[PDB]
Each structure stands twice: as structure tokens, then as C-alpha cells.
């Protein structure tokens, strides 16, 4: 009944729509693009105190100049991250160059949606990935921020918010952000919107933050560095 690859009377794959619904269960992640760099902020969402907050790897680096932030399922990302990384490295191997951001987003996007039931592979993928990613990095073209959806649709964004509170977060990001921000101001605005959404009171322990700039490689904010930003925040 109602195969995976089926078209609704509106012209939408059902499985794709349901996959787009699963992105609301996920925590809220933000990304802002500025000339001085691009920043990622996400909510770790510590359910109970008993668990190590450091063990929620919910931002990872694809390359020294790329960064990824996700929302949706934990398990669904892992394969997309590995694909993104092996593609970056493959490009470096062949061309001795650095894989651009739009290209890694495109490759990851293609890898999505190649799901089916009939005559594919001994173990090919069945249902669409239920995760929405955020690629941000510095390329030969400067700071970039790209947003991906389970439909294999990707677009470069100036500021985007994905996750359970993506609406409202987006209105805030739209009211604040302008074309001439600074990286530090971007961190401040992002942390403030996050604080505004999370149920819990913001602290250095229940978030992660990462920025990538032309000079420094992808950077993870440390507990003390997080406190330093949050105190004035």
C-alpha cells in the first residue's frame, strides 16, 4: 500500500513531506553569514543532568574550512556527514584543491532522495533522510552559508534557522541581521535568539557554537570561551 515513491494528488511525494515534518522534532540551530565569517549556533537540549553534555556531537567539521549544523534525527546525519567528508577529501586528492561549499552541499543533496524499493541494490536506502543540515564555510568566494532539506533542495542563505522553533527564530533573525554585521555581533545575536527560544535558561554547558573565518580554520568554542561570550551576552 502507498509505496515510498508515490505522488500525492497535490504533486508531492508523501515520504518527502513526512520527512519534512520530522525536522520539527529537532532542536533549534542557527547560522549567520557575515563578511568577516560565518557562525553556527545550536541547542544541545540536555534532557537530564545525568548525561555528559560534551557527548552530544551535534556540530561537526566537514573540512578545515567547512562546518555543519543539523536538526532532526541523530542517526540520520551520520551517513551524510561521512559522505560530505569523503567527497571533500576525494576532491582534494584528485585536484589538489579545496572542495568548495556549494559543491559539497550539492553532493550531499544528490546522496539524498536516492531511495526506493524495486531494483536498487542489495541494501540501498529505503526512506528519505529526516534531517535538515546547515553547511557554512569560507571558500575561494568568501563566507558562505547553505541550507539543506530532506527534498534534496539546497540554497545559500544569509541567515537561516532550522528546528523545533525555526518559526519565530526566523522573524527575529530577519529583524536583526543586516548586510554589514560583524562576526562577534553575529555570535551575540545568535546566542540571544537561542536564549530566547530554549525552554531552559542559557548556559555555556547546554549549547555549542562554532565559527569559520578566512584566516582561522573551523573553530569550536570552548567552555571558558563560551562563558566569556555568554557573560556579556
Amino acid at each position: 500500500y502507498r509505496g515510498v515513491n508515490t505522488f500525492s494528488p497535490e504533486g508531492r511525494l508523501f515520504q518527502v513531506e513526512y520527512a519534512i515534518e520530522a525536522i520539527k522534532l529537532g532542536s533549534t540551530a542557527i547560522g549567520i553569514q557575515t563578511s568577516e565569517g560565518v557562525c553556527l549556533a545550536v541547542e544541545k537540549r540536555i534532557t537530564s543532568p545525568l548525561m555528559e553534555p560534551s557527548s552530544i556531537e551535534k556540530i561537526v567539521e566537514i573540512d578545515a574550512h567547512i562546518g555543519c549544523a543539523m536538526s532532526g534525527l541523530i542517526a540520520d546525519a551520520k551517513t551524510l556527514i561521512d559522505k560530505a567528508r569523503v567527497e571533500t577529501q576525494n576532491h582534494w586528492f584528485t585536484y589538489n584543491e579545496t572542495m568548495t561549499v556549494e559543491s559539497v552541499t550539492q553532493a550531499v543533496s544528490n546522496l539524498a532522495l536516492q531511495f526506493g524499493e524495486e531494483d536498487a541494490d542489495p541494501g540501498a536506502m529505503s526512506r528519505p533522510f529526516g534531517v535538515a543540515l546547515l553547511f557554512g564555510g569560507v571558500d575561494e568566494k568568501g563566507p558562505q552559508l547553505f541550507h539543506m532539506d530532506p527534498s534534496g533542495t539546497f540554497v545559500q542563505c544569509d541567515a537561516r534557522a532550522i528546528g523545533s522553533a525555526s518559526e519565530g527564530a526566523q522573524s527575529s533573525l530577519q529583524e536583526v541581521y543586516h548586510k554589514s554585521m560583524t562576526l562577534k555581533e553575529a555570535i551575540k545575536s545568535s546566542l540571544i535568539i537561542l536564549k530566547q527560544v530554549m525552554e531552559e535558561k542559557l548556559n555555556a554547558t547546554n549549547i555549542e557554537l562554532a565559527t569559520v573565518q578566512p584566516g582561522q580554520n573551523f573553530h569550536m568554542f570552548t567552555k571558558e570561551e563560551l562563558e566569556e561570550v555568554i557573560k556579556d551576552i
Binding site: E61, D63, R85, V86, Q89, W92, F93
Partner: protein
């Protein structure tokens, strides 16, 4: 071709010549036989140049994937086992490769020798190439573990110079490297004519 590398109190030094030959014809005197796998791993090239470069570059890609997955750098032993397992799938199929992998791991400075026939060992000092036999004597007589940094530099340079002198297939310039806790550096690239002038 002559390549050289020895562990000692202060790290692992690397030195090599820069000559390529096609029969009796000198194809280039500016090759880079010290391959730079990463900021912490080095690899020399002996035998088939294309094989060494291609397989060492695959190793670099694998190491980067590993450090990116686990969040920690690969060991010298792990990198070497990976190369050996990569080339053993072509035993008796015509590959030529002779390499020393060297870095600074959690176990300290490391130096592994990997070949195309499948060998993989660790040692204090190595030298592989056509001028290897001409360099082993100079190393063995001069080598010491507690040897100072300047003294280690001198020993490596003299060994490669002597190998160049007595061997018809090795020559050019002697590049020399240092491998430390922070990573490797490049020390000098001294032409053999200048070294002849210095030692005579």
C-alpha cells in the same frame, strides 16, 4: 636514489637526494623524494616514483578521514599498517615502492619502513635506495642516539653526500628535515657541489 632517516634523542631527522634517472639519462635533478603526508607524517620515495607518490597520497587522504572521524591523530604504526594493507593487494603485480614513514606519536618518535613486497618494520635508523649501501656505513659509524641536533644534521648531510659521490644513480641536492613534537620543519636544501667545496 638515496633516502635516510634516523630517530634520536630529539626527534627523527629525514634527508634525501633529488635525482631521477631514465636508464643512463638523468631525467631531473630537482625531485622531491621526501613526501609530506601531513603536518606530522613524512614519507620518502624510493623505487617507482609514481607508485610512491600515488599510494602515499591515498594514505594522506585516509589519515585525514581518520582524524576527522575519531577526533584524534593517527599513529605512525596505524598509518604504516594501512599502507602495507593497501599495497599487499598487488603482490606480484609489478609495484615498486620503498618508503619510511616517520612522525611523533603518543609513543614518541616513530619510524616504520614499508615496501611493495609487504615488509613493515620499525627501527632506529634506515636508508633505502640505490645509494643505501653507501649511506649505511657513514650512518652506522657516525650515528648515536644522544647525538645533538647540529650533529644529526651533519651526519645526515654527510651520509647523503657520500652516497651521491660513490653512486651513479643518486645525486643533485640534499634536502634535510626535522620531525618534532609540534611537527616537521624543513632545515636546508644544500647542493652537492657546495658540499664538495665544504668537505674538501
Amino acid at each position: 636514489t638515496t633516502t635516510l632517516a634516523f630517530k634520536f634523542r630529539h626527534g627523527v631527522i629525514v634527508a634525501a637526494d633529488s635525482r631521477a634517472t631514465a636508464g643512463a639519462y638523468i631525467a631531473s635533478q630537482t625531485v622531491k623524494k621526501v613526501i609530506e603526508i601531513n603536518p606530522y607524517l613524512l614519507g620518502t620515495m624510493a623505487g617507482g616514483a609514481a607508485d610512491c607518490s600515488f599510494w602515499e597520497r591515498l594514505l594522506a587522504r585516509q589519515c585525514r578521514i581518520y582524524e576527522l572521524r575519531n577526533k584524534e591523530r593517527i599513529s605512525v604504526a596505524a598509518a604504516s599498517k594501512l599502507l602495507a594493507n593497501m599495497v599487499y593487494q598487488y603482490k606480484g603485480m609489478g609495484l615498486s615502492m620503498g618508503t619510511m614513514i616517520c612522525g611523533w606519536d603518543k609513543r614518541g618518535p616513530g619510524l616504520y619502513y614499508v615496501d611493495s613486497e609487504g615488509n613493515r618494520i620499525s627501527g632506529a635508523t634506515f636508508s633505502v635506495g640505490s645509494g643505501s649501501v653507501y649511506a649505511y656505513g657513514v650512518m652506522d659509524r657516525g650515528y648515536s642516539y644522544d647525538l645533538e641536533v647540529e650533529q644529526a644534521y651533519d651526519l645526515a648531510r654527510r651520509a647523503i653526500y657520500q652516497a651521491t659521490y660513490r653512486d651513479a644513480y643518486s645525486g643533485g641536492a640534499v634536502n634535510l628535515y626535522h620531525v618534532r613534537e609540534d611537527g616537521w620543519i624543513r632545515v636546508s636544501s644544500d647542493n652537492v657541489a657546495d658540499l664538495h667545496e665544504k668537505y674538501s
